[PDB]
């Protein structure tokens, strides 16, 4: 098991650099140095079924690591030779595009149909079914997606669906009580069946 | 053991479980495989098993030539065993596909 700096914020479209670092444990570069490093990798037939898609040939470096905290202090005796190999890869996002992002777009889009219902009571109670549909999808997401200390693209779509549905609940209530007279029937704003999806798409573009 | 497995047709997928054997240090000038025989389990009823073994075990004896390595010392003898199997789609048809239909 090897460790590395990995950033998954662009998941499922992230790119990683898998590295191996090699260094003598006890002999400095005045006693033992690396003269050259050759790397060989698997011959891929078809990467379609592969979780990761390798890009480019393996990269290599030879370098000197100088340590400031070595007890003895003899001239030029605190440097070690280091080999670094890097493998670049891109995640195969096919599974996450067709099974995660697409259904979530259909769920969020379908939530915009509440503005086509005829009664205020219908628009409000249905939104809660939409709200419950995103929560249901959030659980389906979490149980499969990798754990992270930050939100990914999919996590932000889930958040965007919550906001949209919540913003619609507000707009539904507002239009039905806006006029503060009892006959609050702002059909003009209720005719934001086009303006609400466009307002959503606008905020998301930023 | 690792191998190239394709599960796209799941739960109706077929797989080739492979064993590859080779001497770690001795090329085919020093050590070469002369024959390979494979014996498997005697099955009673396959309806309970996750996989169904279709056909006898296939075997190969080939030579692997390594470029990274005297002349004629860069070649190792390799045994390959292959067990063809087919998944049992029963559980997935009744508990997953049918309710989804």
């Amino acid at each position, epitope marked *: 098991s090897f460790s590395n700096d990995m950033d998954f914020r662009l998941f499922p479209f992230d790119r990683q650099q898998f590295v191996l670092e090699l260094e003598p444990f006890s002999y400095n570069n005045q006693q033992l140095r690396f003269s050259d490093i050759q790397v*060989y*990798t*698997e*011959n*891929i*037939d*078809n*990467e379609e079924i592969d979780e990761w898609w390798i890009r480019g040939k393996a990269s290599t470096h030879i370098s000197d690591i100088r340590y400031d905290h070595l007890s003895s202090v003899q001239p030029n005796q605190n440097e070690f030779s280091r080999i670094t190999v890097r493998i670049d890869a891109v995640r195969n996002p096919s599974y996450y595009l067709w099974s995660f992002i697409l259904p979530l777009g259909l769920i969020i889009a379908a939530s915009w149909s509440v503005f086509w219902l005829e009664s205020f009571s219908e628009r409000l109670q249905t939104s809660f079914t939409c709200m419950l549909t995103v929560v249901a999808y959030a659980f389906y997401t979490s149980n499969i997606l990798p754990r992270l200390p930050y939100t990914t693209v999919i996590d932000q779509m889930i958040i965007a669906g919550y906001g949209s549905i919540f913003a619609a609940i507000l707009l539904i209530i507002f239009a039905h009580h806006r006029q503060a007279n009892g006959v609050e029937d702002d059909l003009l704003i209720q005719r934001s069946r086009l303006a609400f999806p466009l307002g959503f798409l606008a905020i998301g573009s930023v | 053991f690792s*191998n*190239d*497995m*394709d599960f796209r047709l799941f739960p109706f997928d077929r797989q*080739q479980f*492979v064993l590859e054997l080779e001497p770690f240090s001795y090329n085919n000038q020093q050590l070469r495989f002369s024959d390979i025989q494979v014996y498997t389990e005697n099955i009673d009823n396959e309806e309970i098993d996750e996989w169904w073994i279709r056909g006898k075990a*296939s075997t*190969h*004896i*080939s*030579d*692997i*030539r*390594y*470029d*990274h390595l005297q002349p*004629n010392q860069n*070649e190792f003898s*390799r045994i*390959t065993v*292959r067990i063809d199997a087919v998944r049992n789609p029963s559980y997935y048809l009744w508990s997953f596909i049918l309710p989804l239909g």
Partner: nanobody
Framework: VQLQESGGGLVQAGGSLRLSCAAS????????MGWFRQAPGKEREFVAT????????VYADFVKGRFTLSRDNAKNMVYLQMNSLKPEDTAVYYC?????????????????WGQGTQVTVS
């Protein structure tokens, strides 16, 4: 995917040939191509193909270091330099493309075979 073999012909025992297989179509690389042969009456048997790890190549037991596989990914071709031929090598040498599975040595895991090139040793 379409494959076309070439380079066959007649030669005497101990001669040499250089077979070529040109790939045309949708291929990810030449790693997926492998040489096979089939003599009259004998099954179609594996000859050579690339190995899983870089620098390695898989050869049938009868090659005995005589044949050597090479590739020009740019021109999208693989070559088979056959040396020290023998009468037993007479056969039709096809060129297949691994269609999946994990048995490079298995013809059943190859397809898009070509018309084949005849090679005869006297």
């Amino acid at each position: 995917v379409q494959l076309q073999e070439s380079g066959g012909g007649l030669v005497q025992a101990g001669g040499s040939l250089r077979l070529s297989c040109a790939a045309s179509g949708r291929i990810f690389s030449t790693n997926v191509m492998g040489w096979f042969r089939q003599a009259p009456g004998k099954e179609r048997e594996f000859v050579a193909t690339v190995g899983r790890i870089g620098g390695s190549t898989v050869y049938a037991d009868f090659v005995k270091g005589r044949f050597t596989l090479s590739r020009d990914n740019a021109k999208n071709m693989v070559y088979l330099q056959m040396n020290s031929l023998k009468p037993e090598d007479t056969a039709v040498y096809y060129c297949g493309a691994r269609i999946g599975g994990s048995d490079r040595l298995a013809p059943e895991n190859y397809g898009y075979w070509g018309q084949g090139t005849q090679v005869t040793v006297s």
